[PDB]
Every structure is written in C-alpha cells, then in structure tokens.
C-alpha cells in the first residue's frame, strides 16, 4: 500500500547518497540492496535496473522544480535556492545526461524527462517575461535572462568543487545567500 | 638592437602559432615539430626558444597573467573603477576556447614537475593578480558601489559568472542569436552584481 512508498523512497535516497559518496559507476544494485537491507529480487519490483533509478532521481528533481511554480520576487529567489543547494547532485545529473539520458536506455522514462524539462523551461521563461512586463527585469530577449541564470548556477556549482571554496572561503552559508541575492537582482532594470 | 627584436618577433610567432594549433586540433595532438613546421623553422631553431612543449604551455599562461597584471595598471584618465571592472569582465570573457584550454593545462603542466621555474613564476604573478583584483573590489566597496560583505564574496561571484559564461559558449545551444548584445548584457551584469 502506502508501504510501497517507504521502500521506493528508501532505495532512492540510499542510491543517491551512495552515488555521491563513492561515484555512480562503482554503485551496483546489490550494494543498494544491502545498504537498505533487502535482496535484489525486491529491488526489481521497484526499479528494473539502475538506469531506472538514474532516470527516476532526475524525474523527481524536475517534478520538485515544477512544484515550485505552483510573489514573483520570492519565486525567482526560491528558484536559485533550489538550483544552487546541493551542487553535488547537480553535477551527478550533468554526468548522467551523457551516461544515460543521451542513450537508448529506459526510453519511456527518458521521453517523460524531455517533456517535463521542456515544460519547466517554459515556466521559467514565463516568470522572466512577467518580471520584464512588471518593469523589474530589463527589456531584452528573455533568453538573455535565462542564459545569464544558467551561467551563474553552472559557475556556482563549479565553485563548490574548488580548493579556493573549501580552504580559503570562510562564511559559506552567508556567501550562499549572497549568491541568491545576486541571482534575483541580475538583469534588473 | 636588431638581433633581439627578430628573436622576440619569432618567439611571438611561435606562441601565436602553437596556440592556434592547440585550439584547432587539440593540444595533445600538436608536437613541437608540427609547430616549427607551421612557422617554417626546424626543430633546432624552435629549441632555442622553448626546450619542450610544456615550456610553450607555461609561457602561454604567463603571458595571460602578465596581460591581466597590465590591465590593473590602466590609468584613471581612461579607466575609472567601474570602467576597469567592465574591462576585467571583457578580458575574462572574450576567448572562451583559451580559458578552457588553460583549465586543462592546469592539470597537465602546472600541477606537475614539468618546467618548475616557470611554474614558480606563474604562482607569484597569480598571487599579485589576486591581490590586485581584491583591491579593486575593496575600493569599490569603500566607494559605496559594492555591498559591504567580505571581499572574497565578490571575487567568488565574479569567478562563478566567468566560469559559467565560458561553459555557455561551449554548449551546443542556436539559442543565442545576437551573441554580441548578450555579451555586453553579460558584462553589465558582471559590473552590477553585488551592487549596494
């Protein structure tokens, strides 16, 4: 029943933690089975392969993003918070783009991923257009704002994996909120 | 004199040619003999300038750092602190292929035992450039332009924006018509981020 959920989200949450601690190529399905305490027979009733776990973790990420779009300033801020919390996951997903998404594996899930990604792209573009029409954002093509936000998030994720960040940068949580302020205010009219 | 001027002219032609060949065919493919042949000299002559490809690598990086240092000697009759801040983003964001090349060379030659005198040189100029850029930040904070947060906040934000812009230009994303207007939009954003 609802108990199917406990397992599912337990394989999901275990797999991801495993993937980020030890690299995803090293993590096999038996390992996620032992870590949660079950056999790979029971793994298969939930996820027929690790690629289904890969895709489900990405589909769940896009679904949480979509939930966010359901105060435009507070929304723009909560979008940068969501994109920039957890840089490790963002990098895992960037890698899975070439390892799983751009292949013939789990094609029904990959097809749904494209659909929710195109839909999320449209929603954030609409937020940009409304902030433009509200006079907050500069009246340039919306992909100016879209690609600027893409660059800022991408470079912030890269920054979090750097020796400067983990050894010289002091107040990491204060900097995090500074990054998000910078995100809300960029391109402002 | 003449002999040194033609020496330095050929050195520069070697560096211009090596860099072009590196970006066109991937640096790992390009031998010194490929470079010498491209400039029309032999191996014996190119050896008189750079004893190995690794020395060409390091010299290209040093040249970059000396270019950045000279940016910080812009006179104020021509560059105020806001104009200098714009010129830094301009210098940083033009040439994404070279930025991406220099990232790879960091692993290949800088963090290794090849050409240790040039590498020691590189870290010294880098430290001076870090101090120069931090100074510009602190002067813009004191002028009321930048938000009064630790200066490394602005430095890391500037790093993140340049890094992401370079990755944007390496993406398959026809998405960016009017790449010149967006380039000047990105520079305004650079100048304006973290403003009070």
| Segments making up each domain of chain B, as ranges | 1-50, 51-196
Angstrom distance (rounded) from CA B124 to CA B69: 12
Rounded to 5 degrees, φ, ψ at B146 are: -95, 150
Distance between A2 CA and the closest CA of chain B, angstroms: 42
Crossing angle of helices A72-84 and A172-185, in 10° steps, is 130
**In Å, how far are A42, A61, A98, B62, B66 from A47, measured between CA atoms?**
9, 17, 21, 52, 55
- Whole-number CA gyration radius for chain B: 19
- Kindly state the DSSP code that residue B106 receives in the 8-state scheme: I
Nearest to B69 by CA among B141, B15, B121, B139: B121
Angstrom distance (rounded) from CA B157 to CA B172: 25
Angstrom distance (rounded) from CA A179 to CA A156: 8
**Inter-residue contact A113 to A58 (CB < 8 Å):** yes
Angstrom distance (rounded) from CA B126 to CA B105: 15
Output the 3-class SS for chain A: CCHHHHHHHHHHHHHHHHHHHHCHHHCCHHHHHHHHCCCHHHHHCCCCCHHHHHHHHHHHHHHHHHHHCCCHHHHHHHHHHHHHCCHHHHHHHHHHHHHHHCCCCCHHHHHHHHHHHHHHHHHHHHHHHHHHHCCCECCCCHHHHHHHHHHHHHHHHHHHCCHHHHHCCCCHHHHHHHHHHHHHHCCEC
**In Å, how far are B37, B122, B139 from B133, measured between CA atoms?**
40, 16, 10
Resolution value (Å, 1 decimal): 2.3
Angstrom distance (rounded) from CA A91 to CA A84: 11
Angstrom distance (rounded) from CA A137 to CA A91: 29
Angstrom distance (rounded) from CA A180 to CA B108: 34
- Whole-number CA gyration radius for chain A: 19
Nearest to B102 by CA among B145, B59, B164: B59
Q: What angle do CA A163, A168, A172 make, to 5 degrees?
A: 95
- Residues in a beta bridge with A137: A188
Q: How many whole angstroms from its chain centre is CA B174?
A: 26
> Hey, are the CB atoms on B157 and A187 less than 8 Å from each other?
no
Q: Other C-beta atoms within 10 Å of B22: how many?
A: 23
Size of interface A-B (CB pairs under 8 A): 81
Angstrom distance (rounded) from CA B72 to CA B136: 9
User: What sign for the dihedral angle of Cα B53, B54, B59, B62?
Assistant: positive
Best to test chain A binding among B107, B131, B156, B187 (most A CBs inside 10 Å): B156
Chain A CB contacts of B164 below 8 Å: 150-156, 158
């Amino acid at each position: 029943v609802r108990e199917f959920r406990r397992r599912e989200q337990e394989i999901l949450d275990t797999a991801l933690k495993l993937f980020l601690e030890q690299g995803e190529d090293s993590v096999t399905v038996e390992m996620i089975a032992d870590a949660v305490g079950i056999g790979k027979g029971t793994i298969y009733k939930h996820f027929k392969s690790k690629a289904e776990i890969y895709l489900r973790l990405m589909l769940d990420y896009e679904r949480d993003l979509a939930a966010l779009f359901h105060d435009k300033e507070a929304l723009s801020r909560a979008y940068f918070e969501f994109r920039m919390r957890d840089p490790q996951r963002y990098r895992l997903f960037d890698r899975l783009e070439e390892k799983v998404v751009k292949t013939s594996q789990v094609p029904e899930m990959v097809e749904e991923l494209h659909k929710i990604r195109a839909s999320n792209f449209e929603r954030l573009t609409q937020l940009i257009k409304e902030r433009i029409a509200d006079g907050k954002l500069e009246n340039v093509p919306p992909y100016f704002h879209y690609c600027a936000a893409w660059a800022l998030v991408h470079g912030a994720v890269a920054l979090y994996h750097s020796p400067f960040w983990r050894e010289v940068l002091e107040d990491q949580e204060g900097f995090f909120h500074f990054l998000m302020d910078i995100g809300v205010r960029m391109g402002n009219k």
